[PDB]
Design a protein around this ligand. Structure first.
Ligand SMILES: CCCCCCCCCCCCCCCCCC(=O)OC[C@H](COP(=O)([O-])OCC(O)COP(=O)([O-])OC[C@@H](COC(=O)CCCCCCCCCCCCCCCCC)OC(=O)CCCCCCCCCCCCCCCCC)OC(=O)CCCCCCCCCCCCCCCCC
Ligand SMILES: CCCCCCCCCCCCCCCCCC(=O)OC[C@H](COP(=O)([O-])OCC(O)COP(=O)([O-])OC[C@@H](COC(=O)CCCCCCCCCCCCCCCCC)OC(=O)CCCCCCCCCCCCCCCCC)OC(=O)CCCCCCCCCCCCCCCCC
Ligand SMILES: CCCCCCCCCCCCCCCCCC(=O)OC[C@H](COP(=O)([O-])OCC(O)COP(=O)([O-])OC[C@@H](COC(=O)CCCCCCCCCCCCCCCCC)OC(=O)CCCCCCCCCCCCCCCCC)OC(=O)CCCCCCCCCCCCCCCCC
Ligand SMILES: C[C@@H]1CC[C@@]2(OC1)O[C@H]1[C@@H](O)[C@H]3[C@@H]4CC[C@H]5C[C@@H](O[C@@H]6O[C@H](CO)[C@H](O[C@@H]7O[C@H](CO)[C@@H](O)[C@H](O[C@@H]8OC[C@@H](O)[C@H](O)[C@H]8O)[C@H]7O[C@@H]7O[C@H](CO)[C@H](O)[C@H](O[C@@H]8O[C@H](CO)[C@@H](O)[C@H](O)[C@H]8O)[C@H]7O)[C@H](O)[C@H]6O)[C@H](O)C[C@]5(C)[C@H]4CC[C@]3(C)[C@H]1[C@@H]2C
Ligand SMILES: CCCCCCCC/C=C/CCCCCCCC(=O)OC[C@H](COP(=O)(O)OCCN)OC(=O)CCCCCCC/C=C/CCCCCCCC
Ligand SMILES: CCCCCCCC/C=C/CCCCCCCC(=O)OC[C@H](COP(=O)(O)OCCN)OC(=O)CCCCCCC/C=C/CCCCCCCC
Ligand SMILES: CCCCCCCC/C=C/CCCCCCCC(=O)OC[C@H](COP(=O)(O)OCCN)OC(=O)CCCCCCC/C=C/CCCCCCCC
Ligand SMILES: [Zn+2]
Ligand SMILES: [Zn+2]
Ligand SMILES: [Zn+2]
Lengths: 124, 52, 62, 230, 226, 196, 121, 120, 65, 107
């Protein structure tokens, strides 16, 4: 249809580049920080790149914060079992905070014996 | 039809923007409140919303 | 209609030039507050036509 | 060449309509609800305006898309009535031996069936004229007279009935099923009030929609008549 | 095509009110400088002037006759361009089925831009495989990694423009001898006399040449209320 | 055979030159069709009437020339000269001489490939065939291997399932001995507590 | 048995060992694994075997660890997860010595049956 | 080798948190005054005027792109005539080192193989 | 325009203002508070305490604390 | 079921005794997060992203033909991240049949 929305249009040229007074090129905000830490590992993974191709994808330590650079440096089966135990221990500790020193009477020895008497009478 | 140059030299010489500085896990705890109480466009919008 | 049953309008009789109809930059200063009110009322001609054709039977039921 | 579809980038009626819906919940007066309903009617009309303006795209699939949408809507209306029939027949074992007066099978059923059949014949004549690219002014006013009688009869029946919604589940189901049909009759008034002759004729989705909808209402009443009156 | 809507009234003819009022300049404008409406009336005025002159038709060659009616003589270049246009238009709302592509005869993938997404479904019967989508970019002979079918991109491009019916006409059609307004007047008097107007486009066209509203009844014809 | 026989577009004629179907609200004028048939003659009658196109006789020499230059076109031109061409005859003439556009592959620019590469076409086809040969054989090989391996899971599941069968088997034996021999089973033992 | 009876157009390795080779590897270092079984610095290419000389379709197999540690490397040269070991060395041995395979599988199955039955019973 | 060291130079550590100085030092909210950048803010983001307040989809700054002849600018292919034939040279994407950074060397080998299919 | 090619171009090109992310996280945080704040309010309304002491509705030993 | 293309014995005969399957690497290379330049503004970063598309990459064979990036579904055919308007020109799904008509050929 003549005059309809074109099926293809060429991009117009980008706006003029900006230079500072001294001639330095102007920089713009960029959310790709260079985290500061001592880790320099580089992990590479063969990745599917369609059906007939792959790509060797690399992860660099300097692109991650300190916490991940520290964890990702260690062998997985060294850190993993420690984390599993640590997380479980923390969960138990957190929930134990709210019941420090709570001593219900129904868990005392006297009450425990009485339940045994009831079970014997009722043949539970 | 408009004619533009390939580049333009700005009058000032300040490099205001660039790569973001390295940050920690809790960097947001102080940066976010700083923006609210220190950026003009932030608290002006808040006051405008609250007032009306 | 500009659909299959009709077609375009000859230039001799075109009264809404899109160059002036569109290009709405600064339109509120060109019509003022009262003109802004009139534009809002006239935008609802479609709704107004429906109400004129819809109220009378409701009055009968009422 | 051109793109197959002229994309719609932005829309603001959705926000307005959704806010109008919320106003129903947050009302402190039933008067606001009445005026809120007018706003909903206005904004829905604007949405219908956009559909008519889309004709300028000259897209062959637009008619088909809207037609199948109506088919889905019709199915939902049928299934809604099915649920009421389901509710009615679940307590069937508790009917006909309670000390209430059920409706007569002679007066109401016959005149309503006759009255609604005339409504179908009027709409059929409208379809025939639409096929022939022709119009008859009187037809619309026959529908209004038909709808006037239906409203007058139903109002009197409810007012003179001696049993109430709280008397038994039978009475509740009778009143509710009859009201649900009335609401669908009133929705037909909303649609038919704008019937006109448009010169683009058989590419106008409104005509086929009205014919399908009016037929649905009438057939539903036959099921209601068999269940309740006969 | 199946994906087009109903023919409009304009698809058959245009209303006389769309005729340019400066006919004298219209008949002198080069084809490359005529717009859609101007080109339509140039061909209709000049085409009907020759067709409504029976005594001259038998002595007029097909080349001249085609030129007067505004019809383009077909040649291999123009035919090639038009053919690929229609194939592109047809594929907008039709399936893409054809012979298996090989190096000698690659599958032709028409496109306006530099890229178009294509899928390979292999051969016929058992040779058909699951769809394998790829981006067909200009300047590469693409080979399916599964069935080894060869694809190639054909671009409808010409001198910073993409092929269109008007573009083909302008590139290849050559303007002939300038239209003579005497022919318009001569044919006008032939079919329009004493209040009988059997050649109405010429009647309007002649009136515009004489200014506007000169011939009988034309002032009343041009006066409108809204 | 479309739209019930009503054409989307058709010509209507009026006898009064100043007639307007939208302005006037009179009730005497009768519109005519393209052939001039008045509207009160129904189409089932008018369509039977034979209408032929009459061109002014000054066009006969031209129509003769068209027939001679294109003999296949002569029979249609003769009908037109003799006033025997109906609308259907015109349509047959129109579509008979319509031809499709031609695309020439020899005019398509080709993707760039060096002479050395063009000489390796047979080699690449040869490699492709061997890949398919290897692919098809491997499918049979893998299908046999893995589906056979699934039997190991069946046998492993049967064994582990049988462990619970044995536990259930022993459980039923134990239950049969509870009410008969087990001292845990007691009678005349539980006494009502009574309301608190 | 793909190379042995199904397909005759893939290179067929020689078994260096029917047991994996244990080696310490370091992250960020690339290792080259012998795919012919004739290198003298197993499990790595020595520069004189078929893999090093690119002879008869044999090429070195590139490998790189994600983390430092001790890893098992295929000695049979047919493990599915080659260069790393996954048990294919034992499987390929059973093909060569099926009588021995029966003894090991019976013994392994016998132990598994006793422990599982003893605990559940 | 460490591939990060190859493109360390390109990655200069940042100065401000989140890449912006305080608005007092530089007002990134205002539209840029640079010629040809009226649709952008100072920090390079699109201005609210361009995208919201005067969006072209709402009828502002009406400018039909298509010309009288129904044409729009189209960039042609890189054509070459050799050996009695007109050839088109396709555009190859730049080296992945330029776009991603890692030096394209010592790439692991992944051969061509057709689809893994179950047979029999 | 090149800037309009990608949806959410500023975010995808890594130039967006961080405040957008903060609002998203704040919105999520506020959503979470709708489960905790009414819990505290309802507890105080019917008991006079924001939160119970563990097992305070049961009999406790003399030294329990 | 699909089991690959059918092959005839004659199609496997080489024209030379030294022919072996070509060892062309189909690993497109080493990649990571797309790394933009601080100097590039919004428009030029968009160009940078458009030049890093894996689905625009291919492997050139020894005869000059290229095997492109291919996917089972068209979701992997749009630019990453997805642009606002993706399929300006309708993607073509190529079917094959043995039917032919004389007009296409010339003697
Ligand atoms: C000596 C005179 C004798 C007269 C005897 C009485 C006859 C009365 C006939 C009334 C028929 C009304 C039918 C209503 C349905 C709609 C009709 C329709 O489509 O009209 C289209 C017609 C034209 O529409 P259009 O769109 O321009 O053209 C469409 C077509 O293309 C073209 O349309 P069309 O031309 O094909 O239309 C054909 C026809 C289609 O309809 C019919 O043919 C239906 C015929 C049904 C007959 C009903 C008779 C009812 C009589 C009952 C009496 C009971 C007495 C009980 C006594 C009890 C004792 C104890 O429609 C009409 O002709 C409708 C009537 C037109 C009159 C309009 C002027 C105002 C009313 C004048 C009434 C005069 C009465 C005089 C009485 C004198 C007696 C001596 O519409 C109009 O003219 C406009 C609206 C008004 C029409 C309705 C008028 C109602 C008048 C009722 C009178 C009788 C009252 C009895 C009361 C008894 C109480 C106890
Ligand atoms: C000699 C050894 C012992 C033999 C015993 C024989 C028993 C009869 C079976 C028939 C005879 C088999 C003879 C085979 C001869 C070899 C033939 C051959 O072709 O060889 C070469 C052939 C291939 O050679 P190749 O190609 O060179 O590659 C060799 C490679 O090594 C690659 O090898 P692959 O890829 O074949 O690797 C196999 C691997 C592959 O497996 C996988 O990839 C699995 C991946 C998913 C893992 C999912 C983990 C579980 C998730 C749980 C979800 C909840 C999470 C909760 C978390 C909580 C928080 C932490 O399979 C497994 O890991 C076994 C999984 C079995 C099911 C697991 C679930 C058991 C549930 C039982 C009921 C529970 C009720 C509980 C009641 C209450 C408590 C008591 O290799 C084999 O055929 C190897 C077969 C060996 C299979 C042994 C599996 C033993 C598992 C025992 C489970 C015991 C459960 C105890 C509890 C029961 C309670 C009721
Ligand atoms: C399930 C969890 C785990 C999930 C794990 C798995 C996740 C997998 C990944 C999933 C990814 C999905 C796909 C993602 C695609 C993202 C695309 C994108 O980024 O689009 C761009 C889009 C916008 O970017 P842009 O294009 O630059 O937009 C420019 C603006 O349009 C224009 O710029 P502008 O500056 O002009 O903007 C205007 C601005 C103007 O801005 C200002 O003026 C700001 C002023 C500062 C205000 C700050 C808040 C102050 C709060 C004070 C509170 C005081 C409390 C006092 C309490 C006292 C108690 C005693 O705002 C406004 O004017 C309106 C704001 C309205 C919205 C915010 C509402 C906040 C909450 C309000 C609550 C009200 C409660 C009342 C209740 C009363 C009941 C009676 O990005 C966003 O919107 C942010 C998205 C961030 C997330 C991205 C995805 C990352 C991956 C996931 C991370 C994990 C998230 C976990 C959930 C959160 C946990 C908390
Ligand atoms: C047996 C009794 C005799 C008496 C009576 O009932 C049956 O005859 C009926 C018939 O005459 C009815 C009329 C039919 C025509 C109706 C026309 C309607 O107006 C039209 O309604 C709008 C929306 O429907 C538009 O249409 C617009 O066009 C408007 O005009 C009006 O709102 C009520 C109306 C007039 C009706 C009022 C009630 C009536 C008079 C009824 C009247 C009581
Ligand atoms: C509470 C129960 C429900 C009632 C409450 C309100 C619900 C509102 C929901 C409305 C849903 C509407 C869906 C419409 C889908 C079909 C649209 C359609 O086909 O319209 C086009 C079609 C034909 O147009 P063409 O230009 O010829 O062709 C179109 C392009 N080819 O046009 C029409 O259908 C015309 C419609 C005209 C009448 C419109 C009336 C609107 C009524 C809205 C009712 C709102 C009432 C709210 C009450 C609230 C308090 C209870
Ligand atoms: C020839 C034309 C008519 C054809 C009719 C076809 C009917 C098809 C019915 C489909 C649903 C069948 C559901 C199974 C039958 C169960 C009947 C039954 O048990 O009824 C009693 C039971 C209640 O008993 P209790 O819960 O135990 O205790 C009640 C104490 N107050 O009722 C029910 O649960 C049944 C309710 C469902 C039936 C009614 C609603 C569903 C039917 C809708 C029909 C719609 C129109 C026809 C559609 C088909 C057109 C081709
Ligand atoms: C009596 C004993 C009391 C003990 C109390 C113990 C409290 C323990 C709390 C443990 C849970 C801590 C949760 C921490 C959540 C951190 C969330 C977070 O990271 O937010 C990220 C998010 C986005 O940041 P970036 O992604 O970095 O964006 C920049 C561009 N990328 O950051 C933000 O939005 C910052 C602001 C988020 C809101 C946080 C504050 C909410 C208000 C908390 C009020 C607490 C009141 C406590 C009163 C106590 C009275 C006794
Ligand atoms: Zn294929
Ligand atoms: Zn080796
Ligand atoms: Zn091994």
């Amino acid at each position: 249809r003549i005059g309809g929305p074109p099926v293809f249009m060429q991009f117009p040229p980008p706006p003029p580049k900006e230079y500072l007074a001294d001639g330095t090129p102007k920089t713009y905000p960029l959310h790709q920080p260079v985290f500061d830490h001592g880790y320099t590992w580089e992990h590479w993974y063969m990745t599917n790149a369609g059906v007939f191709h792959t790509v060797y994808y690399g992860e660099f330590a300097k692109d991650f914060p300190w916490r991940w650079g520290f964890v990702a440096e260690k062998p997985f089966w060294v850190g993993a079992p420690i984390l599993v135990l640590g997380v479980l221990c923390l969960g138990h500790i957190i929930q134990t905070m709210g019941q420090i020193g709570v001593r219900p009477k129904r868990y005392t020895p006297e009450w425990v014996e009485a339940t045994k008497e009831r079970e014997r009478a009722e043949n539970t | 039809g408009r004619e533009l140059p390939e580049y333009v030299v700005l009058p000032h010489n300040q490099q205001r923007y660039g790569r973001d500085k390295s940050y920690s896990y809790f960097t947001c705890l102080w940066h976010f409140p700083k923006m609210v109480f220190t950026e003009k466009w932030c608290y002006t919008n808040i006051m405008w919303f609250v007032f009306w | 209609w500009p659909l299959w049953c009709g077609g375009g309008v000859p230039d001799k009789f075109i009264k809404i030039d899109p160059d002036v109809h569109f290009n709405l930059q600064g339109y509120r200063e060109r019509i003022g507050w009262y003109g802004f009110f009139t534009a809002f009322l006239q935008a609802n001609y479609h709704a107004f036509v429906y109400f004129v054709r819809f109220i009378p039977i409701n009055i009968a039921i009422f | 060449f051109e793109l197959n579809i002229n994309i719609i980038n932005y829309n603001y009626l959705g926000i307005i309509i959704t806010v109008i819906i919320s106003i129903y919940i947050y009302n402190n007066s039933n008067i606001i609800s009445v005026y809120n309903s007018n706003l909903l009617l206005i904004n829905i009309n604007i949405w219908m305006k956009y559909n008519i303006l889309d004709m300028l795209n000259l897209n062959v699939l637009d008619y088909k898309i809207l037609l199948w949408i109506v088919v889905i809507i019709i199915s939902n209306e049928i299934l809604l009535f099915v649920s009421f029939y389901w509710i009615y027949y679940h307590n069937y074992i508790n009917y006909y031996h309670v000390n209430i007066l059920i409706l007569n099978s002679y007066n109401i059923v016959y005149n309503n069936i006759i009255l609604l059949t005339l409504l179908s014949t009027i709409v059929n004549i409208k379809f025939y004229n639409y096929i022939l690219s022709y119009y008859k002014y009187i037809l619309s006013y026959l529908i209004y007279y038909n709808n006037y009688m239906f409203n007058n009869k139903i109002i009197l029946e409810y007012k003179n009935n001696s049993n109430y919604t709280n008397d038994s589940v039978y009475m509740t189901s009778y009143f509710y099923i009859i009201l649900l049909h009335y609401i669908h009759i009133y929705d037909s008034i909303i649609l038919i009030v704008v019937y006109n002759y448009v010169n683009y004729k058989n590419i106008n989705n409104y005509y086929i929609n009205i014919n399908i909808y009016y037929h649905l209402i009438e057939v539903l009443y036959i099921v209601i008549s068999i269940l309740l009156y006969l | 095509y199946r994906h087009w809507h109903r023919m409009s009234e304009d698809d058959w003819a245009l209303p006389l009110d769309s005729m340019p009022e400066d006919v004298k300049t219209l008949m002198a404008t080069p084809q490359t400088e005529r717009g859609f409406v101007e080109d339509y009336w140039y061909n209709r005025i000049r085409g009907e002037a020759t067709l409504l002159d029976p005594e001259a038709l038998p002595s007029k060659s097909y080349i001249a006759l085609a030129r007067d009616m505004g019809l383009q003589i077909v040649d291999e270049p123009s035919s090639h361009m038009m053919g690929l246009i229609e194939l592109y238009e047809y594929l907008r709302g039709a399936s893409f089925v054809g012979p298996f592509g090989t190096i000698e005869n690659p599958v032709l993938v028409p496109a306006v831009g530099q890229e178009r997404v294509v899928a390979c479904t292999g051969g016929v019967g058992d040779e058909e495989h699951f769809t394998l989508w790829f981006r067909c970019r200009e300047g590469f002979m693409y080979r399916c990694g599964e069935c080894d079918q060869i694809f190639m991109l054909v671009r409808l491009y010409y001198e910073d423009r993409y092929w269109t019916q008007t573009l083909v006409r302008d590139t290849f059609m050559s303007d002939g001898d300038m239209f003579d307004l005497k022919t318009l007047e001569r044919v006008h008097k032939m079919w329009n006399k004493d209040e009988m107007v059997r050649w109405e486009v010429g009647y309007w066209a002649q009136d515009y040449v004489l200014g506007k509203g000169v011939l009988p009844g034309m002032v009343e014809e041009h006066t409108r209320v809204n | 055979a479309y739209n019930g026989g009503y054409p989307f577009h058709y010509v209507v004629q009026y006898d009064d030159p100043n007639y307007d179907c939208e302005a006037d609200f009179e009730f005497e004028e009768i519109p005519r069709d393209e052939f001039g048939v008045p509207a009160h003659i129904p189409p089932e009658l008018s369509t039977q009437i034979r209408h032929t196109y009459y061109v002014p006789p000054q066009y006969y020499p031209f129509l003769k020339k068209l027939g001679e230059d294109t003999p296949e076109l002569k029979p249609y031109t003769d009908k037109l000269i003799m006033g025997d061409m109906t609308y259907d005859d015109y349509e047959e003439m129109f579509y008979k001489f319509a031809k499709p556009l031609k695309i020439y592959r020899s005019r398509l620019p080709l993707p760039y490939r060096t002479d050395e590469e063009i000489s390796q076409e047979k080699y690449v086809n040869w490699c492709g065939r061997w890949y398919s040969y290897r692919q098809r054989l491997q499918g049979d090989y893998y299908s046999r291997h893995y589906f056979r391996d699934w039997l190991i899971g069946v046998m492993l599941g049967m064994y582990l399932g049988n462990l619970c069968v044995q536990q259930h088997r022993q459980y039923r034996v134990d239950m049969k001995l509870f009410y008969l021999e087990a001292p845990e089973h007691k009678i005349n033992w539980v006494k009502p507590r009574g309301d608190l | 048995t793909w190379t042995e009876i199904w397909w005759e157009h893939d290179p067929t390795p020689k078994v260096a060992q029917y047991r994996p080779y244990v080696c310490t590897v370091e992250s960020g270092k690339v290792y080259w694994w012998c795919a012919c079984g004739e290198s003298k610095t197993q499990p790595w290419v020595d520069g004189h075997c078929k893999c090093s000389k690119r002879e008869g379709g044999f090429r070195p197999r590139r490998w790189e660890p994600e983390h430092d540690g001790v890893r098992l490397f295929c000695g049979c040269k047919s493990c599915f997860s080659s260069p790393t070991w996954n048990g294919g060395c034992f499987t390929k041995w059973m093909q060569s010595n099926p009588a021995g395979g029966m003894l090991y599988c019976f013994a392994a199955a016998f132990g598994f049956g006793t422990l599982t039955v003893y605990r559940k019973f | 080798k460490s591939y990060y060291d190859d493109f360390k130079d390109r990655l200069k550590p940042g100065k401000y948190t989140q890449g912006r100085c305080p608005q007092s030092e530089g007002d990134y909210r205002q539209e840029s005054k640079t010629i040809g950048r009226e649709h952008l803010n100072d920090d390079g983001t699109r201005s609210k005027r361009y995208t919201v307040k005067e969006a072209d989809a709402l009828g502002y700054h009406y400018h039909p792109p298509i010309d009288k002849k129904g044409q729009v600018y189209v960039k042609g292919p890189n054509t070459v005539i050799e050996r009695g034939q007109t050839w088109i040279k396709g555009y190859e994407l730049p080296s992945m080192e330029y776009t991603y950074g890692p030096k394209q060397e010592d790439i692991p080998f992944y051969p061509r193989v057709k689809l893994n299919v179950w047979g029999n | 325009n090149l800037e309009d090619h990608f949806d959410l171009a500023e975010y995808m090109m890594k130039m967006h203002n961080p405040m957008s992310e903060y609002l998203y996280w704040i919105a999520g945080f506020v959503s979470g508070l709708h489960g905790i704040l009414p819990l505290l309010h309802s507890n105080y309304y019917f008991s006079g305490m924001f939160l119970p002491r563990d097992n305070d509705n049961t009999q406790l030993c003399d030294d329990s604390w | 079921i699909y089991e690959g293309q059918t092959v005839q014995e004659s199609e496997l005969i080489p024209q030379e005794d030294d022919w072996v399957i070509e060892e062309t690497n189909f690993c497109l290379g080493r990649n990571c997060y797309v790394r933009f330049r601080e100097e590039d503004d919004l428009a030029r970063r968009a160009l940078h992203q458009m030049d890093s598309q894996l689905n625009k990459m291919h492997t050139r064979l020894r005869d000059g033909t290229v095997i492109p990036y291919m996917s089972f579904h068209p979701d992997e055919m749009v630019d990453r991240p997805a642009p606002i308007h993706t399929f300006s020109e309708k993607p073509l799904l190529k079917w094959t049949w043995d039917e032919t008509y004389e007009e296409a050929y010339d003697d």
